[PDB]
């Protein structure tokens, strides 16, 4: 039996206290106005074991404790743990353990299973999730954490499913860490009757949920339904105005996500530069280049708390996500008077006669006080720095000119007379000194990124390669949604000719073995939704640009769509226009006044029954 589930089965995505918000989440939900299964009881059952794909939504309106159990398990025989929610009166508990559930899921003393095995985390929650009146429960599981819901609410007179909106309150979710592929329901029998098993299916589709300051959900849109409710979530609101708007490719939702960021597992000894025994001076520094590594910036702050850890260009907290190609590391030691002087654009003595960052520098400086490390009572003259030179320099101009400072008027060349000094000024370090003169060891990490295959990225793991399906790809930071195809393109074109003001990623370079991953849009078809406003009625239309009233069905993938939207993409009452094809209107041979500018001189209105019409812009 197939019925219609109209706006029922909405739960809370996250366990936060957001109030008066419009949060759009992407989890497993039940699409509105979808077909579900409804069975009864006879006196063994009415349907076999239903496949538990992602989640389950059970509805029941009976009483006297007829349906008070749920079975969850992969195979129920030599497998992982199984969820058993047995609702009782004196010893109502949730015994989550590995059992031997047979084919008969009859409650009524425990004849559901045969034997027990090793158990796991078991909840002892005495509050029973039991209470005409309709009982609805949403069971789901993600990241090894089974989530339960319950919205037992008084129901109206006898019917199949009540109207209105409901939000199942969050129950006591529990971590188990298993997988479920089969689902059953327990039934109680007095003499060893009828029941109402209402089972559905949860798909990973987007969902817009609006909250209230009182602490409850007022209304929510499925965002995977008729063009009106489809466009309702693209504007992040619950009301629309009279006019034609565009979609956001939310019809085909990306089921899976692929990352495939790294390709190696060997770590990187970048900490070997930070804990070096003897560093270098500012006069003659050494830049170490690293490539083909695995950068793990989380272990950077494992040392003593540093000072002035300002990372310009990138986010200091978000460092383990963006990839690069080369890692340059130059470390030296400066005085405490210039701890903040070393900065991009900040001028001074070291910005002129020493190392200096360019205008755009994605790397970061990291400095730590080393007063207890480099300090000599007589004087630490081994660490010096160039201060006296001819003129200014440019970034990355390491000079090792060991000559006499000769910017004066007369060529001293050894005598060191007027305007003649030593370039490398040897300033000493001593323990008995102030904090302003303490030595600070500073390393300048440089993250060089070129138009080359990735060599060193973040420490994230890898995913599976999914093909021929609308997925979400995040290979090398090009976070997008589409389908990956294997085209005959021998080389990957560099999309930089016309500066790519408005151009999407047509293809990506596979970080794994050499492949051609061309990116294709899942379903765009140039869909435009003409909403006359929810205040008037709930009837909209559709427009498709670049079709011939016959190619639109095979272009928007009408086969992989909801049955409610299929009727709005048929060949009936279609009209060929100079900008595409109009579907869902009646082309009137006459015109009165232009109200809704569909396009190319075509204007629509909403008059009487009340429906969308089609005409031209007569002047």
């Amino acid at each position: 039996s197939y019925t219609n589930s109209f706006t029922r089965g909405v739960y809370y995505p996250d366990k936060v206290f957001r109030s008066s918000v419009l949060h759009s989440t992407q989890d497993l939900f039940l699409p509105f106005f979808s077909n579900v299964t409804w069975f009864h009881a006879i006196h063994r059952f009415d349907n076999p074991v239903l496949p538990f794909n992602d989640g389950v939504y059970f509805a029941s309106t009976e009483k006297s404790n007829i349906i008070r159990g749920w079975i969850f398990g992969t195979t129920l025989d030599s497998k992982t743990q199984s969820l058993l929610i047995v609702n009782n009166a004196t010893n109502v508990v949730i015994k989550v353990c590995e059992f031997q559930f047979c084919n008969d899921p009859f409650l009524d003393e425990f004849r559901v299973y045969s034997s027990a095995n090793n158990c796991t985390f078991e909840y002892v929650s005495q509050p029973f999730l039991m209470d005409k009146n309709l009982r609805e429960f949403v069971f789901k599981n993600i990241d090894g954490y089974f989530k339960i819901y319950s919205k037992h609410t008084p129901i109206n007179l006898e019917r199949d499913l009540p109207q209105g909106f409901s939000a199942l309150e969050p129950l006591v979710d529990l971590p188990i860490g298993i997988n479920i592929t089969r689902f059953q329901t327990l039934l109680a029998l007095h003499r060893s009757g009828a029941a109402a098993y209402y089972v559905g299916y949860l798909q990973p589709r987007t969902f817009l949920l609006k909250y209230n300051e009182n602490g409850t959900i007022t209304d929510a849109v499925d965002c995977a339904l008729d063009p009106l409710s489809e466009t309702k979530c693209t504007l992040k609101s619950f009301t629309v105005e009279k006019g034609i708007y565009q979609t956001s490719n939310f019809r085909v939702q990306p089921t899976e996500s692929i990352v495939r960021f790294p390709n190696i597992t060997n770590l990187c000894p970048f900490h070997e530069v930070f804990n070096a025994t003897t560093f270098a001076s500012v006069y003659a520094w050494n830049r170490k280049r690293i490539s083909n590594c695995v950068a793990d910036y989380s272990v950077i702050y494992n040392f003593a708390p540093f000072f002035a850890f300002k990372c310009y260009g990138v986010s200091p907290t978000k460092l383990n996500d963006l990839c690069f190609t080369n890692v340059y590391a130059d470390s030296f030691v400066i005085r405490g008077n210039e701890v903040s002087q070393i900065a991009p654009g900040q001028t001074g003595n070291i910005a002129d006669y020493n190392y200096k960052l360019p205008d755009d520098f994605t790397g970061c400086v990291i400095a730590w006080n080393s007063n207890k490390l480099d300090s000599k009572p007589s004087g630490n003259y081994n660490y010096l720095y160039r201060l006296f030179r001819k003129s200014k320099l440019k970034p990355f101009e390491r000079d090792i000119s060991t000559e006499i400072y000769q910017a004066g008027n007369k060529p001293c060349n050894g005598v060191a007379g007027s305007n003649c000094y030593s370039p490398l000024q040897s300033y000493g370090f001593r323990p008995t000194y102030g904090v302003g003169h303490q030595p600070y060891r500073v390393v300048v990490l440089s993250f060089e990124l070129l138009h080359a295959p990735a060599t060193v990225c973040g420490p994230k793991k890898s995913t599976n390669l999914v093909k021929n399906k609308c997925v979400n790809f995040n290979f090398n930071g090009l976070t997008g949604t589409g389908v990956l195809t294997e085209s005959n393109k021998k080389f990957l074109p560099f999309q930089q000719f016309g500066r790519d003001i408005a151009d999407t990623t047509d293809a990506v370079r596979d970080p794994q073995t050499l492949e051609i991953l061309d990116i294709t849009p899942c379903s765009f078809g140039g869909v435009s939704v003409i909403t006359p406003g929810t205040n008037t009625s709930n009837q909209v239309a559709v427009l498709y640009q670049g079709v011939n009233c016959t190619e639109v069905p095979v272009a928007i993938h009408a086969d992989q769509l909801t049955p409610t939207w299929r009727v709005y993409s048929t060949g009936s009452n279609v009209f060929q226009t100079r900008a595409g094809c109009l579907i869902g209107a009646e082309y009137v041979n006459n015109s009165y006044e232009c109200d809704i500018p569909i396009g190319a001189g075509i204007c629509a209105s909403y008059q009487t029954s009340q429906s969308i019409i089609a005409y031209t812009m007569s002047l």
Epitope: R287, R289, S291, G313, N326, Y328, P358, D360, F361, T362, G363, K394, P395, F396, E397, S446, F447, E448, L449, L450, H451, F494, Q496, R499, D500
Partner: nanobody
């Protein structure tokens, strides 16, 4: 206000040797990296090789990896591309470009390009 002039090009034969030049006058940035690009009939543009300005890092494409060679001499500030063992799929317009390593993937400047026509 800078430019990248090129020199050298014409009809050649398969399995030969060719030298392409890329010079500049007002360009003095040391960290700006250099690169070559090729435009062939039918397709658009394809990257050939890249010399990083931070150090001595050189990188080639997948087809011209062990075939061509590059040399970025900073004494007179000029780039040279020596193409040996010219195959059939080498007739194209070659352009020299310069881009900053820190930033987007788009090239900062272009060149005049030379037509390498393999007989």
């Amino acid at each position: 206000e800078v430019q990248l002039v090129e020199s050298g090009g014409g009809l050649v034969q398969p399995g030969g040797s060719l030298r392409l030049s890329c010079a500049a006058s007002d360009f003095y940035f040391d960290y700006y990296e250099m690169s070559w690009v090729r435009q062939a009939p039918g397709q658009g543009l394809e990257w050939v090789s890249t010399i990083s300005g931070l150090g001595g890092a050189t990188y080639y494409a997948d087809s011209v990896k062990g075939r061509f060679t590059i040399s970025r001499d900073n004494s007179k500030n000029t780039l040279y591309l020596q193409m040996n063992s010219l195959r059939a799929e080498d007739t194209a317009l070659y352009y020299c470009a310069t881009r900053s390593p820190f930033g987007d993937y788009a090239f900062s400047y272009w060149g005049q390009g030379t037509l390498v026509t393999v007989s």
